């Protein structure tokens, strides 16, 4: 079977950014429901079980560019007193709607904490070594929820 719309696709991957390896793993996604980054989805379209390939995904097709207005300062008064602000730690904030907003603290300067709301891989081009381990047709419940079961 070939990778296409409404197919649950599981694949192994390893990600190269700037010639360095940053993660490697295995995951399954529902194809065609905006669950994978566009470039990777376009790359996997039409592939058949067992295939393997390299794929270059520019930032536009993967997690987008870095927004400079995605960086601002929030007082430490807003962080959990129990929790520690340290460059690299990640917390959640809330929008006016109350929907969550992830963040990564970049630096702490006393009362002032500098944080980035951008995706950690914004403005970063991606290199993938990917093999397609399995394709299957999705189940009704997965289609009703828009995501693959596991």
């Amino acid at each position: 079977m070939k990778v296409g719309q409404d197919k649950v696709v599981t694949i192994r991957y390893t990600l190269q950014v700037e010639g360095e390896v940053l993660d490697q793993g295995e995951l399954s996604y529902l194809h065609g429901h905006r669950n994978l980054i566009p470039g990777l989805e376009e790359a996997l379209e039409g592939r058949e079980e067992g295939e393997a390939f390299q794929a270059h995904v520019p930032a536009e097709k993967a997690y987008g560019p870095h927004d400079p207005e995605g960086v601002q300062v929030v007082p430490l008064s807003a962080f959990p007193e129990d929790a520690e602000v340290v460059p690299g730690a990640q917390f959640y904030a809330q929008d006016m709607e109350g929907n969550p907003m992830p963040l990564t603290v970049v630096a702490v300067e006393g009362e002032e904490v500098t944080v980035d709301f951008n995706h950690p891989l914004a403005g970063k081009d991606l290199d993938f070594q990917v093999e397609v381990v399995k394709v299957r047709e999705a189940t009704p419940e997965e289609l009703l929820h828009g995501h693959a079961h596991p």
């Binding site: 601002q72 807003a78 959990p80 929790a83 917390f91 959640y92 904030a93 929008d95 006016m96 963040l103």
Partner: peptide
């Protein structure tokens, strides 16, 4: 962008 004046929560 701008944040609700509310406590952050860890991952």
């Amino acid at each position: 962008t701008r944040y609700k004046n509310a406590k952050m929560l860890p991952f």
